[PDB]
Amino acid sequence: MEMILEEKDASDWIYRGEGGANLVLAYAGSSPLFVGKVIRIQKARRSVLTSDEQHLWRENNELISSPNKEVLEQRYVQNVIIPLLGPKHVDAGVRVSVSKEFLECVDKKVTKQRPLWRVNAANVDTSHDSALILNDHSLFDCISVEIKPKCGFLPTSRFIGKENILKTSVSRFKMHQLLKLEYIEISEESEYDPLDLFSGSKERVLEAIKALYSTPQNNFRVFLNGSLILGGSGESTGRTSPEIGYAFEDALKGFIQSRTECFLQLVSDAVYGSGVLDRLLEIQKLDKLDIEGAIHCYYDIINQPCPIALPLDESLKIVKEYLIAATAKDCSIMISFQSTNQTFDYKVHFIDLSLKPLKRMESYYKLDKKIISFYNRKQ
Amino acid sequence: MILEEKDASDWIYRGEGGANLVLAYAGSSPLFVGKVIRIQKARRVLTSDEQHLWRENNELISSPNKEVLEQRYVQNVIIPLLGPKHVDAGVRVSVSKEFLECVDKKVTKQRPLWRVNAANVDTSHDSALILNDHSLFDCISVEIKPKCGFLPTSRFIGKENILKTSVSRFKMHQLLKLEYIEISEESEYDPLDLFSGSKERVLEAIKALYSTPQNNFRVFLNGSLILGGSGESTGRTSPEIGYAFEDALKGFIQSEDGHRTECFLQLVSDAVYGSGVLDRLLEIQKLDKLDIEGAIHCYYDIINQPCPILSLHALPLDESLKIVKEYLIAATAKDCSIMISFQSYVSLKPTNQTFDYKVHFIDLSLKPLKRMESYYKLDKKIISFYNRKQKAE
Ligand SMILES: O=P(O)(O)O[C@H]1[C@@H](OP(=O)(O)O)[C@@H](OP(=O)(O)O)[C@@H](OP(=O)(O)O)[C@@H](OP(=O)(O)O)[C@@H]1OP(=O)(O)O
Ligand SMILES: O=P(O)(O)O[C@H]1[C@H](OP(=O)(O)O)[C@@H](OP(=O)(O)O)[C@H](OP(=O)(O)O)[C@@H](OP(=O)(O)O)[C@@H]1OP(=O)(O)O
Ligand SMILES: Nc1ncnc2c1ncn2[C@@H]1O[C@H](COP(=O)(O)OP(=O)(O)O)[C@@H](O)[C@H]1O
Ligand SMILES: Nc1ncnc2c1ncn2[C@@H]1O[C@H](COP(=O)(O)OP(=O)(O)O)[C@@H](O)[C@H]1O
Ligand SMILES: [Mg+2]
Ligand SMILES: [Mg+2]
Ligand SMILES: [Mg+2]
Ligand SMILES: [Mg+2]
Ligand SMILES: [Zn+2]
Question: Could you say which residues bind ATP here (chain B)?
Answer without folding.
Answer: 17-20, 38, 132-134, 143-145, 218, 363
